[PDB]
Design an enzyme around this catalytic site. Structure first.
Site, PDB file in Angstrom:
ATOM      1  N   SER A  80       0.859  -2.198  -4.695  1.00 55.13           N
ATOM      2  CA  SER A  80       0.380  -0.910  -5.172  1.00 55.13           C
ATOM      3  C   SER A  80       0.436  -0.862  -6.693  1.00 55.13           C
ATOM      4  O   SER A  80       1.452  -1.226  -7.291  1.00 55.13           O
ATOM      5  CB  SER A  80       1.215   0.230  -4.575  1.00 55.13           C
ATOM      6  OG  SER A  80       2.181   0.698  -5.495  1.00 55.13           O
ATOM      7  N   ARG A  86      -4.385  -1.239  -5.483  1.00 51.14           N
ATOM      8  CA  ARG A  86      -4.301  -2.669  -5.221  1.00 51.14           C
ATOM      9  C   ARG A  86      -4.562  -2.915  -3.740  1.00 51.14           C
ATOM     10  O   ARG A  86      -3.889  -2.336  -2.881  1.00 51.14           O
ATOM     11  CB  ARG A  86      -2.935  -3.221  -5.628  1.00 51.14           C
ATOM     12  CG  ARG A  86      -2.711  -3.284  -7.133  1.00 51.14           C
ATOM     13  CD  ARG A  86      -1.420  -4.015  -7.491  1.00 51.14           C
ATOM     14  NE  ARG A  86      -1.516  -5.458  -7.297  1.00 51.14           N
ATOM     15  CZ  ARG A  86      -1.103  -6.104  -6.215  1.00 51.14           C
ATOM     16  NH1 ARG A  86      -0.593  -5.463  -5.179  1.00 51.14           N
ATOM     17  NH2 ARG A  86      -1.205  -7.430  -6.175  1.00 51.14           N
ATOM     18  N   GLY A 129      -3.186   0.627   5.660  1.00 53.47           N
ATOM     19  CA  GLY A 129      -3.297  -0.332   6.740  1.00 53.47           C
ATOM     20  C   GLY A 129      -4.556  -1.165   6.631  1.00 53.47           C
ATOM     21  O   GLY A 129      -4.891  -1.648   5.546  1.00 53.47           O
ATOM     22  N   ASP A 135       7.212  -1.853  -5.528  1.00 52.46           N
ATOM     23  CA  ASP A 135       6.449  -2.563  -4.513  1.00 52.46           C
ATOM     24  C   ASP A 135       5.369  -3.389  -5.193  1.00 52.46           C
ATOM     25  O   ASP A 135       4.833  -2.991  -6.230  1.00 52.46           O
ATOM     26  CB  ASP A 135       5.810  -1.600  -3.506  1.00 52.46           C
ATOM     27  CG  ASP A 135       5.304  -2.307  -2.262  1.00 52.46           C
ATOM     28  OD1 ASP A 135       5.334  -3.554  -2.227  1.00 52.46           O
ATOM     29  OD2 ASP A 135       4.857  -1.617  -1.323  1.00 52.46           O
ATOM     30  N   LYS A 146      -8.608   4.812  -2.716  1.00 50.92           N
ATOM     31  CA  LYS A 146      -7.963   5.170  -1.461  1.00 50.92           C
ATOM     32  C   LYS A 146      -8.007   6.661  -1.163  1.00 50.92           C
ATOM     33  O   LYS A 146      -7.742   7.052  -0.021  1.00 50.92           O
ATOM     34  CB  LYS A 146      -6.502   4.696  -1.454  1.00 50.92           C
ATOM     35  CG  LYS A 146      -6.241   3.289  -2.018  1.00 50.92           C
ATOM     36  CD  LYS A 146      -7.237   2.215  -1.564  1.00 50.92           C
ATOM     37  CE  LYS A 146      -7.377   2.153  -0.043  1.00 50.92           C
ATOM     38  NZ  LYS A 146      -8.369   1.133   0.396  1.00 50.92           N
ATOM     39  N   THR A 190       0.837  -1.193   0.000  1.00 48.22           N
ATOM     40  CA  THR A 190       0.000   0.000   0.000  1.00 48.22           C
ATOM     41  C   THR A 190       0.876   1.248   0.000  1.00 48.22           C
ATOM     42  O   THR A 190       1.861   1.322   0.732  1.00 48.22           O
ATOM     43  CB  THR A 190      -0.944   0.026   1.218  1.00 48.22           C
ATOM     44  OG1 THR A 190      -1.728  -1.173   1.241  1.00 48.22           O
ATOM     45  CG2 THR A 190      -1.878   1.223   1.144  1.00 48.22           C
ATOM     46  N   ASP A 226      -2.601   4.388  -4.495  1.00 50.04           N
ATOM     47  CA  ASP A 226      -2.615   3.184  -5.309  1.00 50.04           C
ATOM     48  C   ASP A 226      -4.038   2.640  -5.379  1.00 50.04           C
ATOM     49  O   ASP A 226      -4.990   3.268  -4.911  1.00 50.04           O
ATOM     50  CB  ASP A 226      -1.639   2.155  -4.748  1.00 50.04           C
ATOM     51  CG  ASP A 226      -2.215   1.377  -3.579  1.00 50.04           C
ATOM     52  OD1 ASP A 226      -2.878   0.345  -3.817  1.00 50.04           O
ATOM     53  OD2 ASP A 226      -1.996   1.793  -2.421  1.00 50.04           O
ATOM     54  N   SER A 283       3.624   0.509   2.856  1.00 48.63           N
ATOM     55  CA  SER A 283       4.671  -0.488   2.661  1.00 48.63           C
ATOM     56  C   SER A 283       5.652  -0.038   1.586  1.00 48.63           C
ATOM     57  O   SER A 283       6.853  -0.323   1.662  1.00 48.63           O
ATOM     58  CB  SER A 283       4.053  -1.839   2.304  1.00 48.63           C
ATOM     59  OG  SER A 283       5.039  -2.741   1.836  1.00 48.63           O
TER      60      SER A 283
END
Lengths: 232, 275, 248, 139, 220, 58, 240, 239
Positions: free
Chosen positions: E169, E19, E47, E166, E33, E1, E17, E129
């Site tokens: 995301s 995902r 989170g 990452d 988001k 995230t 993001d 993350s």
């Protein structure tokens, strides 16, 4: 009959609670307010006239929005109106949080009616000396409701309570038609304010809010002045 | 599917703004597909505006009346009852203006016969007012008074009469004056009709002012005439008429019938043709 | 005297506040229901329709409670709404706990217990609302119960409550043939009763509020008579009255 | 006993107006400020056949009252009597008579025999004071 | 995230993001988001998704009530104060990493509350993350007092580095732009990776599945 | 039928008022409209003007 | 007719709450008076001081107080109700600052404390704090504000307001001054307040008998005008 | 004065509200219960339903547990409330001790409930008197009367409601040891006591019989005509 006009938990031998009727009499002595439901929207207005122009008219507003599409006007006590606005906002926002969807105005009227009739349940707490006019648009339909100090709620094509409410109601029933347009609805509302305004409404002497498909919005002083000039 | 209709509308609007008799008579039957393709309200107001200009500019009674019967036959084949009654009321007004006493009277009675059951009241008030006008013009004073009283009773449940109220006060003033018995009430009714006619309709306003000033004369108070002529509301309507009424007031107050006859010779152009 | 708070006992034993809550229903709108052979209905009077009520509602005097429960209200509007909401809460609490629609008698007794608790103790004014619950249950088929602000109840096959209720119920019992009315004859009887009990020479369908409950195809359907339907029924009863008088 | 005696007076009035032995050519006029508090037995046809309402003057009635009261009055010197009439105010004919009388008083005090808009306006403001003196939380 | 936030010369730009993953398997590729709170303030959560959702609606409702009672547009300090008070009320039991940025009468503002309930005012800040790659870009290419379109591509390449450094995301980019006279809710701002074309039809035509019993119930 | 719950004295009063309506127009006949207006005039009574008070009861 | 003037929660016939008006009359019972005037960027509060004896400490008998570092307050009525209400107002302002992170606007402070007084007058558990309030302050994008609160919970903004025994005459004088449509600079606002007090009292007071507070845009802090500056202001008024 | 207060002693030492609630029972309806050697009977006057009332829900006689029954006189809502509470308490007592509730226990609970409802303001006393009947574990016939004052008492055959004094005197004059020798004799006594006040007979009477743990069935309206035929037969038999 006098021994029963003192508490809210005793039934009069003939009729009903007399304190509710006295709260209604307090309502009928308030500032006149008229709400009109047009085909495409609703309009509600009131008179803000007060002596001592020293008073800041912008400081307080008699027409307030509850959500993006619900507005309300009152007639009667001021502080009780403010408290009712606070409780209505809290209830509508609780409904929004629970359902993540704008609150239907019928449910808002039902819940505000329940909360005000709650104050009528027991003694030691007086009923609200305020009657509410609820304007709302949803499901392609403009809704207009009246909420009572007794907790009663009913619908209204176009009504007017407060001072000189009988004459205003006669005027409305002699003016209103089911195919009325929004601008003509505002014209009729301002005329209803006029026929008992007693003192030549100005742009700030009255306060009018409007709701439609685009939500509810209280009219700015400029548009109020323009409409007053148009009616003349 | 509607561009041809738009061309028809453009031609018809240019015609109506120009407004000649032959072009107008063409336009009434020239909205033959339009009247049944648009709403009743706009069609009614359009045809009534054409009729208004038709009777106001090209005062050829023979063609206008036949136009009204063609229009009622049209609305009877097309089933436009509200429009039917509206044009019948306009024809009653035209008959009265051309003084067709009996045609107006009987067809207005027939109209009111079916109009009582209809929910329309503003048109009912108009019809009753015109019937009272006819009854007054026929010297049927008590029946004119009864018709006017019925009209006022109906208009007690009226829907925003802009000029219908003013016309009603004017006609009630006429009835009271013709009754010859009271004038203060006639004074008040004429004043109300004038003040209602303010900023709405000018010729009817000046006729109401003339009637009010006449009522002042009839009360033998010419001083109030000379006070009212200078009233702040009469200035916008001041002219030959108010001066003529002022001079006849002077002739009355001086009680010189020679001055009276001079005032009436002056009136011959101004205010002797007016019943 | 003994007209103080409801938790008082007159020396003769009468509960005067409860008595006044009783007689107060005489000021409410007239509503009745009768039990047909294969149907049940609720007829109510719209006492207040002045000119400009939006009628943004499904029914005013009749309030639905459940897929199987419906009632008519008669009393103060606030207590009416509170009673209806508590009815919904109790019925659906029973449904959640028991996974079965609540029996009409059980829900009626629940309401009666609440109403009694509102006059048994607490110094609170009793609910001045008299109810006419209509519904179906597999235990007794179609049942109709007449509530009471006192907290009592009764199972009835014909009952009117509201203004002019005494004369209405008297003539209703005069003209009730138990066990032999269908929905149509029941509708005609209700319309005649309304004719006799309302203060109108010709009652308008607007002033009339009829909802019918009927079980068919394994499911119970509650429907309020639509304006077309109610006008057809009232016009049929009107020509029936015309037939009766021309024969007379 | 006193209330019983008052009701006895009322009952004698009823039985005299429309009792066993009728009256011929005896028309009774009765005036009150609160009709709704009257006994229904007294407000029925055969006793009070016509209950005539005397409302506050409306517009034209105000004009008529002003005209008939200022008639004996001295000239107003081109005062907007019609505008004073046109002002929307719930004033009874007693108040119109007051207003005119008070204008006369002000004219006497200022020693001018012909009133005009100044003392007439002071009289009008004086008569219909209606000073609210009301705490604004009521409104 | 990944959640990121910068202040540019005139207002705020937010990057989020799309995902959403439960465990080690992605749940959805186009989750939203950027959360609506006020017509002048906006937040991004990270989170526990449900916690972020519910706390965002709660604060948005409370702040709408606040603004309606006041009649003025809400300020960022007010929103973040209530947000941090309620976050600290639960003392980290809610795994909600939110970043708050908006514009008030005092100017643009941008705050970042970690799930435990601490906040700080930053001209530029990211969390999640993938916060490592975003903040690396934030030190690499970011410039203060920097114009609107260059703010847009700055945030876009920052979130692009986040998605391409990452796993948690990507698949969409959505941006929210805050200004004293502009609110641009770009959603999606620019899809970074569209799903590849399917080369083979698996031929799911009629009659391929047998049934036990039939039951027909008409309605309407 | 136009007289729901009208006492007999009110009926005689309606007759009288229809007669007076005939007298006002200086006629001798009474028409149906005269009786309708007499019924409206005699039976006229003050209702509850305040709708909200009237809506206390369901 | 009467007899309904015993309980705060009882509605009289005609729907008139007697006891609230009784409290409004109790406002006057303090025997003092106070006025507030607002300029383009200033708001001046002045109040009268009555001292039965020299025996009291004049530094503690101030009738105007400070709610927050930029919000000042003046009030009259019963002094015990006055101090309780200022304590409640300070409590509410501090709670607002704690919860929302920025200073309380004057309008919102008046609204909340008026809601408190409304809840007091709505339930019969409270005597509705029979003291009237006037609050002053500066707010961005709106400028100075002057707001008044009363025991009924009715709050409203004022271009100029008054309270005490001489309420009606002070309000009439205020209207007479404001109808002239003049800018009311800071010294001009202060002098209008002093002249209003002196004329409605007809005393032409010594400078030691008045306490003055002022809030301006350049001085958002609620400054209690000290003896030196009030002397300057009002003796300048004298000579001016 | 001293009457409109539940918890105020009068100068002559009376709680007048309690006595007024007690008197409220006398405005109810006659309900007489007799206990026999193996049976207990409940005779109550039934209100003749006019034309529409459903007699299924006009229950005057109700059983608290499978081993106890009760008839009431007073306001029906109070009776319903006390019935619900007392049967809930019977079930909870069986929860606590697993054995069937004895008549003494349930009568004591009812009396204590009524008493706790008549010792504080804001709580109106239960204006109902109930006749508790049933058999114990050892099958002893016991009958109890509960008074709205919150007290209870053991009665061999008692009547409550209107005309309860006349039925009381009738039972005094007619209750014999041999009158309860057989079930039919107890029935004859109870119907005789009923028809003392409700002389119409036939309808307007409801009967219930509890034998030694039969889970009483109320006498259905087929043998009430049979039993009243027997009553009339014996009545023309001794006269």
């Amino acid at each position: 009959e006098r021994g029963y006009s003192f508490s809210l938990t005793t039934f009069s031998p003939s009729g009903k609670l007399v304190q509710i009727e006295y709260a209604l009499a307090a309502v009928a002595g308030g500032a006149p307010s008229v709400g009109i439901k047009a085909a495409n929207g609703v309009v509600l207005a009131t008179e803000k006239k007060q002596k001592s122009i020293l008073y800041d008219e912008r400081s307080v507003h008699k027409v307030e929005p509850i959500t993006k599409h619900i507005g309300l006007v009152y007639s009667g006590m001021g502080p009780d109106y403010r408290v009712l606005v606070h409780r209505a906002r809290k209830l509508a926002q609780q409904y929004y949080l629970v359902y993540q969807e704008p609150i239907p105005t019928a449910q808002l009227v039902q819940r505000v009616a329940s909360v005000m009739q709650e104050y009528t349940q027991s003694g030691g707490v007086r009923p609200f000396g305020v009657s509410l006019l609820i304007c709302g648009w949803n499901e392609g339909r403009p809704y207009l409701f009246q909420s009572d100090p007794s907790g009663a709620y009913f619908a209204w094509k176009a009504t007017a309570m407060g001072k000189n409410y009988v004459n205003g109601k006669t005027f409305l029933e002699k003016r209103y038609n089911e195919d009325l347009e929004l601008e003509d609805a505002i014209h009729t509302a301002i005329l209803t304010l006029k026929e008992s305004f007693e003192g030549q409404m100005t742009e700030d002497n009255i306060e009018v809010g409007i709701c439609n498909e685009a939500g509810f919005r209280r009219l700015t002083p400029t548009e109020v002045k323009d409409y007053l000039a148009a009616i003349a | 599917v509607q561009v041809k209709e738009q061309s028809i509308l453009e031609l018809g609007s240019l015609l109506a703004k120009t407004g000649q008799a032959a072009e107008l008579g063409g336009l009434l039957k020239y909205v033959r597909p339009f009247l049944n393709s648009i709403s009743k309200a706009k069609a009614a107001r359009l045809v009534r505006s054409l009729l208004d200009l038709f009777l106001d500019m090209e005062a050829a009674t023979g063609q206008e009346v036949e136009l009204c019967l063609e229009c009622i036959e049209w609305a009877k084949s097309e089933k436009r009852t509200f429009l039917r009654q509206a044009l019948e009321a306009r024809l009653v007004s035209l008959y009265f203006d051309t003084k067709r006493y009996q045609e107006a009277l009987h067809l207005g009675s027939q109209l009111l016969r079916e109009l009582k059951k209809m929910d329309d009241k503003a048109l009912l008030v108009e019809v009753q007012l015109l019937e009272s006008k006819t009854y007054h013009a026929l010297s049927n004073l008590p029946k004119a008074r009864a018709a006017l009283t019925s009209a006022r009773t109906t208009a007690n449940a009226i829907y925003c009469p802009p000029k219908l109220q003013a016309t009603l006060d004017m006609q009630s003033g006429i009835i009271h004056a013709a009754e010859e018995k009271d004038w203060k009430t006639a004074y008040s009714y004429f004043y109300e009709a004038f003040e209602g006619y303010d900023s709405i309709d000018s010729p009817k306003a000046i006729t109401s002012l003339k009637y009010m000033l006449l009522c002042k004369i009839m009360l033998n108070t010419p001083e109030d005439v000379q006070a009212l002529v200078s009233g702040k509301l009469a200035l916008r309507y001041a002219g030959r008429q108010t001066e003529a009424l002022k001079c006849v007031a002077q002739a009355s107050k001086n009680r010189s019938l020679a001055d009276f006859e001079k005032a009436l010779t002056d009136y011959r152009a101004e205010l002797r043709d007016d019943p | 005297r003994y007209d103080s708070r409801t938790t008082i006992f007159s020396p003769e034993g009468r509960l005067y506040q409860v008595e006044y809550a009783m007689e107060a229903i005489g000021h409410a709108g007239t509503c009745l229901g009768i039990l047909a052979n294969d149907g049940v209905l609720l007829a109510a009077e719209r006492r207040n329709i002045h000119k400009l009520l939006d009628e943004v509602f499904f029914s005013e005097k009749i309030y639905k409670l459940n897929e199987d429960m419906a009632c008519s209200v008669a009393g103060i509007t606030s207590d009416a709404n509170v009673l209806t909401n508590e009815l919904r809460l109790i019925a659906q609490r029973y449904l959640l706990q028991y996974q079965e629609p609540i029996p009409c008698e059980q829900l009626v007794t629940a309401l009666c217990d609440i109403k009694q608790a509102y006059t048994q103790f607490g110094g609170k004014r009793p609910f001045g609302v008299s109810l006419l619950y209509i519904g179906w249950d597999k235990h007794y088929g179609f049942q109709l119960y007449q509530s009471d602000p006192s907290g009592n109840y009764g199972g009835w096959k014909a009952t009117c409550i509201g203004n002019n209720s005494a004369a209405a119920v008297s003539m209703l019992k005069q003209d009730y043939k138990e066990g032999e009315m269908t929905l149509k004859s029941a509708l005609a009887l209700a319309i005649k009763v309304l004719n006799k009990t309302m203060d109108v020479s010709k009652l308008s369908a607007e002033k009339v509020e009829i909802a019918t409950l009927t079980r068919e195809n394994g499911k119970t359907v509650i429907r309020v008579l639509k304006q077309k339907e109610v006008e057809q029924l009232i016009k049929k009863h009107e020509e029936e009255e015309a037939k009766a008088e021309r024969e007379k | 006993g006193a209330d019983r005696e008052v009701q006895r007076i009322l009952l004698e009035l009823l039985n005299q107006m429309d009792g066993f032995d009728q009256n011929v050519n005896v028309k009774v006029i009765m005036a009150t400020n609160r009709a709704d508090t009257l006994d229904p037995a007294l407000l029925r046809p055969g006793r009070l056949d016509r209950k005539i309402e005397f409302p506050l003057p409306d517009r034209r009635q105000k004009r008529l009252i002003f005209s008939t009261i200022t008639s004996k009055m001295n000239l107003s010197e081109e005062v907007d009597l019609e505008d004073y009439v046109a002002r929307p105010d719930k004033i009874s004919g007693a108040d119109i008579n007051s207003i005119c009388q008070e204008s006369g008083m002000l004219a006497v005090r200022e020693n001018r025999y012909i009133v005009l808009a100044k003392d007439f306006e002071k009289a009008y403001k004086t008569v219909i004071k209606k000073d609210e003196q009301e705490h604004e939380f009521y409104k | 995230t990944t959640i990121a936030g910068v202040v540019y010369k005139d207002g705020i730009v937010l990057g989020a993001d799309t995902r959403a993953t439960e465990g080690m398997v992605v749940a959805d590729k186009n989750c939203s988001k950027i959360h609506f709170i006020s017509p002048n303030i906006y937040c991004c959560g990270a989170g526990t998704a449900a916690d972020t959702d519910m706390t965002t609606q709660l604060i948005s409702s409370n702040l709408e009530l606040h603004s309606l009672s006041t009649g003025r547009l809400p300020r960022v300090v007010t929103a973040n104060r209530m947000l941090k008070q309620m976050l600290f009320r639960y003392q980290g039991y809610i795994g909600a990493a939110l970043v708050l940025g908006g514009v008030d009468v005092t100017g643009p503002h941008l705050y970042s509350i970690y799930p435990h309930g601490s906040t700080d005012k930053l001209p530029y800040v990211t969390m999640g993350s993938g916060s490592l790659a975003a903040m690396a870009v934030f030190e690499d290419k970011f410039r203060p007092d920097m114009e609107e379109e260059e703010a847009k591509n700055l945030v876009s390449e920052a979130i692009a580095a986040g998605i391409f450094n990452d796993l948690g995301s990507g698949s969409n980019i959505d941006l929210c732009v805050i200004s004293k006279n502009k609110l641009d809710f770009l959603r999606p701002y620019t899809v970074p990776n569209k799903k590849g074309t399917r080369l083979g039809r698996y031929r799911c035509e009629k009659g391929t599945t047998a049934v036990l019993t039939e039951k027909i119930t008409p309605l309407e | 039928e136009l007289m729901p719950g009208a006492s007999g004295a009110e009926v005689k009063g309606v007759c009288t008022e229809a007669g007076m309506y005939a007298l006002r127009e200086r006629r001798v006949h009474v028409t149906q409209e005269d009786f309708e207006m007499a019924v409206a005039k005699v039976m006229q009574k003050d209702s509850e003007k305040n709708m909200s008070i009237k809506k206390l009861w369901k | 007719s009467a007899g309904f003037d015993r309980h705060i929660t009882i509605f009289s016939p005609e729907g008139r709450l007697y006891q609230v008006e009784y409290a409004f009359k109790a406002i006057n019972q303090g025997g003092l008076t106070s006025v507030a005037v607002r300029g383009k960027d200033c708001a001046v509060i002045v109040t009268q001081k009555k001292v039965p004896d020299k025996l009291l400490d004049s530094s503690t008998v101030t009738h105007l107080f400070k709610i927050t570092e930029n919000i000042g307050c003046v009030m009259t009525g019963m002094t015990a109700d006055s101090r309780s209400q200022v304590q409640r107002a300070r409590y509410e302002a501090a709670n607002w600052k704690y919860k929302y992170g920025y200073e309380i606007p004057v309008d919102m402070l008046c609204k909340r404390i008026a809601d408190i007084s409304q809840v007091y007058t709505q339930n019969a558990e409270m005597r509705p704090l029979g003291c009237c309030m006037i609050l002053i302050g500066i707010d961005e994008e709106q400028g100075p504000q002057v707001y008044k609160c009363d025991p009924a919970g009715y709050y409203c903004g004022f271009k100029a307001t008054a309270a005490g025994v001489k309420q009606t005459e002070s309000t009439s004088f205020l209207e007479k001054k404001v109808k002239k449509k003049f800018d009311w600079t800071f010294e001009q606002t202060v002098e209008t307040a002093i002249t209003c007090l002196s004329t409605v009292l007809s005393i032409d007071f010594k400078p030691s008998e008045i306490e003055v507070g002022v809030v301006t845009v350049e001085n958002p802090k609620f400054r209690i005008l000290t003896e030196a500056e009030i002397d300057a202001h009002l003796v300048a008024l004298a000579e001016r | 004065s001293y009457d409109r207060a539940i918890t105020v002693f009068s100068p002559d030492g009376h709680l007048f509200q309690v006595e007024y609630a007690q008197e409220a029972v006398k405005k109810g309806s006659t309900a007489v219960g007799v206990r026999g050697r193996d049976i207990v009977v409940l005779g109550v006057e039934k209100k003749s339903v006019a034309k529409l009332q459903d007699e299924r829900t006009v229950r005057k006689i109700c059983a608290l547990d499978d081993n106890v029954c009760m008839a009431f006189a007073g306001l029906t809502a109070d009776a319903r409330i006390v019935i619900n509470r007392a049967r809930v308490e019977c079930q909870s007592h069986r929860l606590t001790v697993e054995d069937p509730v004895t008549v003494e226990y349930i009568t004591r609970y009812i009396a204590s409930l009524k008493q706790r409802y008549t010792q504080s303001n804001g709580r109106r006393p239960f204006g109902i008197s109930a006749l508790i009947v049933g058999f114990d574990f050892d099958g002893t016939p016991r009958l109890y009367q509960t008074d709205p004052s919150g007290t209870y008492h053991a009665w061999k055959a008692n009547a409550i409601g209107r005309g309860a004094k006349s039925v009381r005197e009738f039972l005094e004059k007619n209750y014999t040891d041999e009158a309860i020798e057989t079930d039919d004799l107890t029935i004859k006594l109870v119907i005789k006591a009923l028809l003392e006040v409700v002389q119409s007979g036939g309808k307007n009477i409801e009967l219930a019989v509890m034998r030694r743990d039969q889970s009483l069935k109320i006498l259905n309206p087929e043998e009430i005509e049979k039993y009243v035929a027997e009553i009339e037969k014996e009545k023309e038999e001794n006269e």
